[PDB]
Amino acid sequence: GAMVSGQIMHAVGEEGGHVKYVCKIENYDQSTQVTWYFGVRQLENSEKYEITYEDGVAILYVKDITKLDDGTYRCKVVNDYGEDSSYAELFVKGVRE
């Protein structure tokens, strides 16, 4: 392309609930691979995170929200030509001023 990774919107998470992040990719192809991060931590499918990627749409769902989950989330996109990343925040009540 490209690729270019699209803008991701911020979210407020309530304790015990969930939030989602959606990142739309321009000029994806057969070599495109997507990895999400929370702060310094690399994410994978588990009891905590529901992660999918198909046809230029990356989706991260975060479950069972706690105060620990407040911070910065990154969607990192890599192919045979280069890379791009997009970022957004999760705000939980009681964490930030």
mmCIF file with all atom_site columns, C-alpha atoms in Angstrom:
data_model
loop_
_atom_site.group_PDB
_atom_site.id
_atom_site.type_symbol
_atom_site.label_atom_id
_atom_site.label_alt_id
_atom_site.label_comp_id
_atom_site.label_asym_id
_atom_site.label_entity_id
_atom_site.label_seq_id
_atom_site.pdbx_PDB_ins_code
_atom_site.Cartn_x
_atom_site.Cartn_y
_atom_site.Cartn_z
_atom_site.occupancy
_atom_site.B_iso_or_equiv
_atom_site.pdbx_formal_charge
_atom_site.auth_seq_id
_atom_site.auth_comp_id
_atom_site.auth_asym_id
_atom_site.auth_atom_id
_atom_site.pdbx_PDB_model_num
ATOM 1  C CA . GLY A 1 1  ? 0.000   0.000   0.000  1.00 0.00 ? 1  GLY A CA 1
ATOM 2  C CA . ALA A 1 2  ? 0.717   1.376   2.503  1.00 0.00 ? 2  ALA A CA 1
ATOM 3  C CA . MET A 1 3  ? -0.468  -0.303  4.839  1.00 0.00 ? 3  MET A CA 1
ATOM 4  C CA . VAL A 1 4  ? -1.947  2.453   6.952  1.00 0.00 ? 4  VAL A CA 1
ATOM 5  C CA . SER A 1 5  ? -3.558  1.569   10.244 1.00 0.00 ? 5  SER A CA 1
ATOM 6  C CA . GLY A 1 6  ? -6.744  3.651   10.888 1.00 0.00 ? 6  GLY A CA 1
ATOM 7  C CA . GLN A 1 7  ? -7.735  5.723   13.967 1.00 0.00 ? 7  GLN A CA 1
ATOM 8  C CA . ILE A 1 8  ? -9.005  3.876   17.062 1.00 0.00 ? 8  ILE A CA 1
ATOM 9  C CA . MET A 1 9  ? -11.436 5.605   19.512 1.00 0.00 ? 9  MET A CA 1
ATOM 10 C CA . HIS A 1 10 ? -10.969 5.892   23.319 1.00 0.00 ? 10 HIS A CA 1
ATOM 11 C CA . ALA A 1 11 ? -13.324 4.014   25.732 1.00 0.00 ? 11 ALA A CA 1
ATOM 12 C CA . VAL A 1 12 ? -14.559 4.132   29.374 1.00 0.00 ? 12 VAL A CA 1
ATOM 13 C CA . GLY A 1 13 ? -14.659 0.695   31.031 1.00 0.00 ? 13 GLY A CA 1
ATOM 14 C CA . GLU A 1 14 ? -16.822 -0.037  34.050 1.00 0.00 ? 14 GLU A CA 1
ATOM 15 C CA . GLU A 1 15 ? -15.578 -2.583  36.617 1.00 0.00 ? 15 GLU A CA 1
ATOM 16 C CA . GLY A 1 16 ? -16.783 -6.088  35.622 1.00 0.00 ? 16 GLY A CA 1
ATOM 17 C CA . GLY A 1 17 ? -17.877 -4.942  32.161 1.00 0.00 ? 17 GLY A CA 1
ATOM 18 C CA . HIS A 1 18 ? -16.152 -4.932  28.753 1.00 0.00 ? 18 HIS A CA 1
ATOM 19 C CA . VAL A 1 19 ? -14.911 -2.473  26.040 1.00 0.00 ? 19 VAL A CA 1
ATOM 20 C CA . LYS A 1 20 ? -13.927 -2.901  22.347 1.00 0.00 ? 20 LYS A CA 1
ATOM 21 C CA . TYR A 1 21 ? -11.342 -1.364  20.046 1.00 0.00 ? 21 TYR A CA 1
ATOM 22 C CA . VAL A 1 22 ? -11.725 -1.418  16.245 1.00 0.00 ? 22 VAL A CA 1
ATOM 23 C CA . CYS A 1 23 ? -8.893  -0.655  13.848 1.00 0.00 ? 23 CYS A CA 1
ATOM 24 C CA . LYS A 1 24 ? -9.501  -0.550  10.084 1.00 0.00 ? 24 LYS A CA 1
ATOM 25 C CA . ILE A 1 25 ? -6.440  -1.218  7.813  1.00 0.00 ? 25 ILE A CA 1
ATOM 26 C CA . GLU A 1 26 ? -5.834  0.296   4.361  1.00 0.00 ? 26 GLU A CA 1
ATOM 27 C CA . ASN A 1 27 ? -3.925  -1.769  1.741  1.00 0.00 ? 27 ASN A CA 1
ATOM 28 C CA . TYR A 1 28 ? -3.806  -4.999  3.737  1.00 0.00 ? 28 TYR A CA 1
ATOM 29 C CA . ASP A 1 29 ? -2.744  -8.177  1.877  1.00 0.00 ? 29 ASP A CA 1
ATOM 30 C CA . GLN A 1 30 ? -1.923  -11.897 2.358  1.00 0.00 ? 30 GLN A CA 1
ATOM 31 C CA . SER A 1 31 ? 1.186   -11.075 4.425  1.00 0.00 ? 31 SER A CA 1
ATOM 32 C CA . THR A 1 32 ? -0.549  -8.728  6.928  1.00 0.00 ? 32 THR A CA 1
ATOM 33 C CA . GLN A 1 33 ? -0.192  -9.820  10.640 1.00 0.00 ? 33 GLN A CA 1
ATOM 34 C CA . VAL A 1 34 ? -1.756  -7.906  13.595 1.00 0.00 ? 34 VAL A CA 1
ATOM 35 C CA . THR A 1 35 ? -0.573  -7.867  17.222 1.00 0.00 ? 35 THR A CA 1
ATOM 36 C CA . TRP A 1 36 ? -2.141  -5.875  20.104 1.00 0.00 ? 36 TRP A CA 1
ATOM 37 C CA . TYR A 1 37 ? -0.348  -4.539  23.245 1.00 0.00 ? 37 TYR A CA 1
ATOM 38 C CA . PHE A 1 38 ? -1.479  -3.150  26.610 1.00 0.00 ? 38 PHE A CA 1
ATOM 39 C CA . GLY A 1 39 ? 1.295   -0.819  27.748 1.00 0.00 ? 39 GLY A CA 1
ATOM 40 C CA . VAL A 1 40 ? 4.460   -3.004  27.546 1.00 0.00 ? 40 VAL A CA 1
ATOM 41 C CA . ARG A 1 41 ? 2.538   -6.315  27.437 1.00 0.00 ? 41 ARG A CA 1
ATOM 42 C CA . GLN A 1 42 ? 1.903   -8.360  24.264 1.00 0.00 ? 42 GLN A CA 1
ATOM 43 C CA . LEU A 1 43 ? -1.722  -9.658  24.109 1.00 0.00 ? 43 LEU A CA 1
ATOM 44 C CA . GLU A 1 44 ? -3.133  -13.028 23.022 1.00 0.00 ? 44 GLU A CA 1
ATOM 45 C CA . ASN A 1 45 ? -6.507  -14.834 23.061 1.00 0.00 ? 45 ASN A CA 1
ATOM 46 C CA . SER A 1 46 ? -7.380  -15.967 26.606 1.00 0.00 ? 46 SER A CA 1
ATOM 47 C CA . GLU A 1 47 ? -10.087 -15.765 29.286 1.00 0.00 ? 47 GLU A CA 1
ATOM 48 C CA . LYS A 1 48 ? -9.305  -12.012 29.316 1.00 0.00 ? 48 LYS A CA 1
ATOM 49 C CA . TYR A 1 49 ? -8.988  -10.880 25.608 1.00 0.00 ? 49 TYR A CA 1
ATOM 50 C CA . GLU A 1 50 ? -11.059 -11.741 22.483 1.00 0.00 ? 50 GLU A CA 1
ATOM 51 C CA . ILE A 1 51 ? -8.947  -10.838 19.426 1.00 0.00 ? 51 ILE A CA 1
ATOM 52 C CA . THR A 1 52 ? -9.834  -11.253 15.770 1.00 0.00 ? 52 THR A CA 1
ATOM 53 C CA . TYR A 1 53 ? -8.422  -10.106 12.407 1.00 0.00 ? 53 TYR A CA 1
ATOM 54 C CA . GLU A 1 54 ? -10.050 -10.621 8.966  1.00 0.00 ? 54 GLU A CA 1
ATOM 55 C CA . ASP A 1 55 ? -10.303 -8.655  5.706  1.00 0.00 ? 55 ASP A CA 1
ATOM 56 C CA . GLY A 1 56 ? -8.648  -5.442  7.033  1.00 0.00 ? 56 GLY A CA 1
ATOM 57 C CA . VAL A 1 57 ? -10.608 -5.217  10.274 1.00 0.00 ? 57 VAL A CA 1
ATOM 58 C CA . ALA A 1 58 ? -8.812  -5.758  13.623 1.00 0.00 ? 58 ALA A CA 1
ATOM 59 C CA . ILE A 1 59 ? -10.960 -6.079  16.771 1.00 0.00 ? 59 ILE A CA 1
ATOM 60 C CA . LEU A 1 60 ? -9.856  -6.275  20.421 1.00 0.00 ? 60 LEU A CA 1
ATOM 61 C CA . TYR A 1 61 ? -12.444 -7.020  23.115 1.00 0.00 ? 61 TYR A CA 1
ATOM 62 C CA . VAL A 1 62 ? -11.349 -6.584  26.767 1.00 0.00 ? 62 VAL A CA 1
ATOM 63 C CA . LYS A 1 63 ? -13.363 -8.585  29.399 1.00 0.00 ? 63 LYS A CA 1
ATOM 64 C CA . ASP A 1 64 ? -13.941 -8.489  33.206 1.00 0.00 ? 64 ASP A CA 1
ATOM 65 C CA . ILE A 1 65 ? -12.659 -4.904  33.540 1.00 0.00 ? 65 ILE A CA 1
ATOM 66 C CA . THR A 1 66 ? -10.624 -3.881  36.649 1.00 0.00 ? 66 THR A CA 1
ATOM 67 C CA . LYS A 1 67 ? -8.707  -0.718  37.657 1.00 0.00 ? 67 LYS A CA 1
ATOM 68 C CA . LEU A 1 68 ? -5.532  -2.490  36.324 1.00 0.00 ? 68 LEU A CA 1
ATOM 69 C CA . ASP A 1 69 ? -6.888  -2.149  32.773 1.00 0.00 ? 69 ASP A CA 1
ATOM 70 C CA . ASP A 1 70 ? -6.648  1.692   32.677 1.00 0.00 ? 70 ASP A CA 1
ATOM 71 C CA . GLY A 1 71 ? -3.929  2.801   30.161 1.00 0.00 ? 71 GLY A CA 1
ATOM 72 C CA . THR A 1 72 ? -2.784  2.773   26.535 1.00 0.00 ? 72 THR A CA 1
ATOM 73 C CA . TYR A 1 73 ? -3.637  0.070   23.920 1.00 0.00 ? 73 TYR A CA 1
ATOM 74 C CA . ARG A 1 74 ? -1.648  -0.317  20.620 1.00 0.00 ? 74 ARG A CA 1
ATOM 75 C CA . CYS A 1 75 ? -2.646  -2.142  17.414 1.00 0.00 ? 75 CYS A CA 1
ATOM 76 C CA . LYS A 1 76 ? 0.565   -3.062  15.548 1.00 0.00 ? 76 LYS A CA 1
ATOM 77 C CA . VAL A 1 77 ? 0.311   -4.018  11.853 1.00 0.00 ? 77 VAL A CA 1
ATOM 78 C CA . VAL A 1 78 ? 3.157   -5.672  9.917  1.00 0.00 ? 78 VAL A CA 1
ATOM 79 C CA . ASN A 1 79 ? 3.569   -6.954  6.368  1.00 0.00 ? 79 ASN A CA 1
ATOM 80 C CA . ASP A 1 80 ? 6.222   -7.686  3.721  1.00 0.00 ? 80 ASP A CA 1
ATOM 81 C CA . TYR A 1 81 ? 6.631   -3.972  2.962  1.00 0.00 ? 81 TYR A CA 1
ATOM 82 C CA . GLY A 1 82 ? 6.665   -2.291  6.371  1.00 0.00 ? 82 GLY A CA 1
ATOM 83 C CA . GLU A 1 83 ? 4.603   -1.561  9.478  1.00 0.00 ? 83 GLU A CA 1
ATOM 84 C CA . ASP A 1 84 ? 2.239   0.965   11.162 1.00 0.00 ? 84 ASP A CA 1
ATOM 85 C CA . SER A 1 85 ? 0.565   1.297   14.610 1.00 0.00 ? 85 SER A CA 1
ATOM 86 C CA . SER A 1 86 ? -2.497  3.072   16.071 1.00 0.00 ? 86 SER A CA 1
ATOM 87 C CA . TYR A 1 87 ? -3.191  3.877   19.773 1.00 0.00 ? 87 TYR A CA 1
ATOM 88 C CA . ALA A 1 88 ? -6.137  4.547   22.150 1.00 0.00 ? 88 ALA A CA 1
ATOM 89 C CA . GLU A 1 89 ? -6.873  4.887   25.894 1.00 0.00 ? 89 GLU A CA 1
ATOM 90 C CA . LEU A 1 90 ? -9.065  2.930   28.330 1.00 0.00 ? 90 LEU A CA 1
ATOM 91 C CA . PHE A 1 91 ? -10.318 5.050   31.282 1.00 0.00 ? 91 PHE A CA 1
ATOM 92 C CA . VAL A 1 92 ? -11.607 3.380   34.522 1.00 0.00 ? 92 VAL A CA 1
ATOM 93 C CA . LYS A 1 93 ? -13.307 5.427   37.330 1.00 0.00 ? 93 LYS A CA 1
ATOM 94 C CA . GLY A 1 94 ? -10.975 5.890   40.373 1.00 0.00 ? 94 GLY A CA 1
ATOM 95 C CA . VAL A 1 95 ? -7.614  5.664   38.491 1.00 0.00 ? 95 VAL A CA 1
ATOM 96 C CA . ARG A 1 96 ? -6.758  8.996   36.785 1.00 0.00 ? 96 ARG A CA 1
ATOM 97 C CA . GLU A 1 97 ? -7.508  12.424  38.296 1.00 0.00 ? 97 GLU A CA 1
#
